[PDB]
């Protein structure tokens, strides 16, 4: 929602099918003393947080929402037809809606979740592209941003570029690029620090069978059938697409409101969150319910009229986060320092070591020549490497910095952490 003349948003667009992205800061442990700090040297070493266990609270009453589009390319029912269809007019689009595939997932790690989608690249140049050609396809990884859309079962791609009609799908997805996680490339990471853990459940089934209506891109070669006549003189459009249909939802398949416990993950990180930083990304279809209310512009007249009532739509959203954490130290040697500095050197900035110490070791390869000039050859003066790199990438934010407490007992979640390990006397 935005002011009509302005570009400024009046109301933010939100629905369940938007992905969620949570970024969570932690205060530096090493700024942060202890009741008894004697057990380590803070000089020769450091302190770094670790994430043992995680919860996701969700409080709404469970129910399914939905979407549609007023204009949709459609021919007619393909399921049962007494007689052959009618002649194709101009713009037979109709108002029809459908339910999206029910889905649940969870994502955790220190590096942003990596996405992928279909999309258009540049055709190799032999044939000059004429309007109406089939644009070639390309597989593209990208960082995942908030507000992005789950698949509905139409697959990750850019409708905006690849779909000109702009009417071929219901609204919510028409604008953006629905995206989907690739477990492979992610888990293929050498450090695994993208994500160390995850869970997913989803299901779908067919409901209806329809036809696109539009200019035929290609006709099947005849030999795959036999010529018609009369009503069969002409071939109806070849296209079809299913209508995805959500199923019965249960309280059981809910993956939330229940604790988790991590020890070993497919990645070599064990719950280490570098740079005091941690990521969670979660998406649910189950709360999608859309309440609808009506306002009366005139309260007097006693005869019902469709004139008196405007209609609006707002959607509920409820999250909670509770994170266990563990505390850890690091010894320093060369091998250590080396091995880290390889992995991500930016990490070492926010610490001291004590710092001068690895401010680059590498002698240059000797690119050299004039140190002045306005006259002789071109030279470089670009360099800066963008120290808050991902600030380009917007997404939802929460600060915890202030909230830590030192006693599990006082919280609902924690005492379970005790119970799992027992030990009824709090250390």
């Amino acid at each position, epitope marked *: 929602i935005k002011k009509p003349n302005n570009n400024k948003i009046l109301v933010p667009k939100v629905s369940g099918l938007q992905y969620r992205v949570f970024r969570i800061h932690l205060p530096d442990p090493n700024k942060f003393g202890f009741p008894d700090t004697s057990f380590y040297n803070p000089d020769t070493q450091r302190l770094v947080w670790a994430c043992v266990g995680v919860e996701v609270g969700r409080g709404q009453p469970l129910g399914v929402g939905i979407s549609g589009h007023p204009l949709l390319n459609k021919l007619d029912d393909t399921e049962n037809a007494s007689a052959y269809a009618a*002649n*194709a007019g101009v713009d037979n689009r109709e108002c029809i809606s459908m339910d999206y595939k029910q889905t649940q997932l969870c994502l955790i790690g220190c590096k942003p979740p990596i996405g992928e989608h279909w999309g258009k690249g540049s055709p190799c140049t032999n044939v000059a592209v*004429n309007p*109406g050609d089939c644009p070639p396809l390309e597989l593209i990884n990208t960082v995942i941003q908030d507000g992005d859309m789950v698949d509905t079962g139409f697959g990750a791609m850019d409708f905006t570029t690849l779909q000109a009609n702009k009417s071929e799908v219901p609204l919510d997805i028409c604008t953006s690029i629905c995206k989907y996680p690739d477990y492979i490339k992610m888990v293929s990471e050498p450090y695994g620090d993208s994500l160390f853990f995850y869970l997913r459940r989803e299901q779908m089934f067919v409901r209806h069978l329809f036809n696109r209506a539009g*200019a035929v*891109g*290609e006709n099947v070669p005849d030999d795959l059938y036999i010529k018609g006549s009369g*009503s069969t*003189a002409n071939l109806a459009s070849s296209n079809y697409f299913p209508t995805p249909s959500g199923s019965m939802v249960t309280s059981d398949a809910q993956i939330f409101n229940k604790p988790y416990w991590l020890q070993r993950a497919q990645g070599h990180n064990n719950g280490i969150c570098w740079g005091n930083q941690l990521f969670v990304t979660v998406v649910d279809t189950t709360r999608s319910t859309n309440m609808s209310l009506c306002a009366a512009i005139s309260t007097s007249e006693t005869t019902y009229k469709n004139t008196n009532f405007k209609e609006y739509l707002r959607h509920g959203e409820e999250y909670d986060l509770q994170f266990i954490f563990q505390l850890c130290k690091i010894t320093l040697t060369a091998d250590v320092m080396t091995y880290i500095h390889s992995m991500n050197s930016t990490i070492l900035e926010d610490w001291n070591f004590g710092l001068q110490p690895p401010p680059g070791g590498t002698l240059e390869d000797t690119y050299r020549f004039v140190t002045s000039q306005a006259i002789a050859c071109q030279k470089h003066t670009p360099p800066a490497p963008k120290e808050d790199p991902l600030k380009k990438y917007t997404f939802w934010e929460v600060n915890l910095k202030e909230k830590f407490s030192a006693d599990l007992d006082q919280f609902p979640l924690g005492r379970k952490f005790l119970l799992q390990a027992g030990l009824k006397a709090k250390p």
Partner: antibody
Amino acid sequence: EVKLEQSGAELARPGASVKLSCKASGYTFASYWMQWVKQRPGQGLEWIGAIYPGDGDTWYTQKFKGKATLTADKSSSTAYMQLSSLASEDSAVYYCARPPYYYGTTYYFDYWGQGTTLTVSG
Amino acid sequence: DIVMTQSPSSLAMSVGQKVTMSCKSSQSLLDSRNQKNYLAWYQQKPGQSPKLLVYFASTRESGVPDRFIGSGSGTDFTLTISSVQAEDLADYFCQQHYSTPLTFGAGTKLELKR
């Protein structure tokens, strides 16, 4: 709006090759089937075949199987008819237009082109 | 591969008279589901460009007074013509939209008067 340029006239030698053109206005040139119709006095209307510029798929009636050939280019937005190895009775009017096929319709015709006449041999 | 028969060859006539040419062909232009008739009608005055008159059977094309009204049913058909003026003289054609390839009528040449 609806317009076709059916242009030229020609006289040529036996066994030679010929060329024809029909051009588009007020629609998408490549989005439908197209026609070529031979007009010979005393016989007249005859349906050669049809071509759909989208891929340029073809239809060749038993008569014109072989010798007749059809292609077009949409950047030109102009029809072509390529015929070779001429003959005397080939002399006639080739008078063609575009039926609506799609267009919320089927066969027969909404239109007739300009007309063009070919004479062989010289 | 079917064949159309277009008759009569020529008819002289006078103003306002009601004249009917005949349409004849082998198979049925017509079966009943959509009750489609594949007959066509074309007017060509000599030397100029032909044009569409009537398709199906009961079609009335935009720009045609009732001086032309379709007729014929079943297989072989006719054209009813109500009242003829001088401009109505022309060379008619009736042909077929069905079962590729296409098939045409022989020809229809109206003869004038006196």
